[PDB]
Design a protein around this ligand. Sequence first.
Ligand SMILES: O=C1Nc2ccc3ncsc3c2/C1=C/Nc1ccc2c(c1)CS(=O)(=O)C2
Length: 282
Amino acid sequence: MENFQKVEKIGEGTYGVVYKARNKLTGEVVALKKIRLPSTAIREISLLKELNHPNIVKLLDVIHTENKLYLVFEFLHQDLKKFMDASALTGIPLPLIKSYLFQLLQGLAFCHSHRVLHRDLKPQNLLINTEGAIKLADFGLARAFGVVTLWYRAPEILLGCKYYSTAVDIWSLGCIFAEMVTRRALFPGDSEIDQLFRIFRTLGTPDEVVWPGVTSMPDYKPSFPKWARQDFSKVVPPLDEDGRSLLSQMLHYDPNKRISAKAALAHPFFQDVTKPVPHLRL
Ligand SMILES: O=C1Nc2ccc3ncsc3c2/C1=C/Nc1ccc2c(c1)CS(=O)(=O)C2
């Protein structure tokens, strides 16, 4: 770590603090993560170094020195949370929302094809550059290591499913899509039950008809209040029918019915996708 000069703190993640740093040898500007503290973890994190894609933040190096772990990542100058805040008065243009959603689905389709899940997608780990690219940061770390935001958590995780699938990432990205469009978080829960009941109040309390097996889930309670579903026209105005159709498939309750990233890329909403240039203030 004597090979790195810390510039400034750029994040306070779940696995540890993230710093902007300069590699004293190559002159490279990187994102340095010091993991807060196992052999199983080293092996799984070593596999992530090979999971390379243009929409995935590159894991450059794994440094296991003095019983401490450091992850060296590719550096990007802004995240989607800051960009959404900077664009709050005018909203992100629909062509740029569509481009970012299409690129994130490409990154998801790639990781999911390698049986790698993110599990904790949120605007703070979606990173953007001046070329119009958007990249996913921290794919696979949750599985590798084993106040936290609940806003993007899939309902099967909240209902105590221990063996959840790639569908959890589609749910999180659907919540992010809705937030880019409306300029407000879709389900801003501040406890696990508030998160669950916010989902229920919008999409309706799930039952055996819409989600076979839901009533046998570990944290399912028959005492859950029964709310009726709301129209998507009310949930994400002024999003057109193609966008609302795609979002509804990303937010299906049953993980098995929820659209895959690969099928989502073929949805008619992406018929006119382009790659615009965002205006970034750095
Ligand atoms: O470049 C990076 N790579 C990684 C890899 C993993 C990882 N985990 C959590 S963050 C992160 C980052 C990362 C953060 N970058 C960055 C740079 C500048 C600004 C922000 C973020 C927030 S802002 O938009 O308010 C100003």
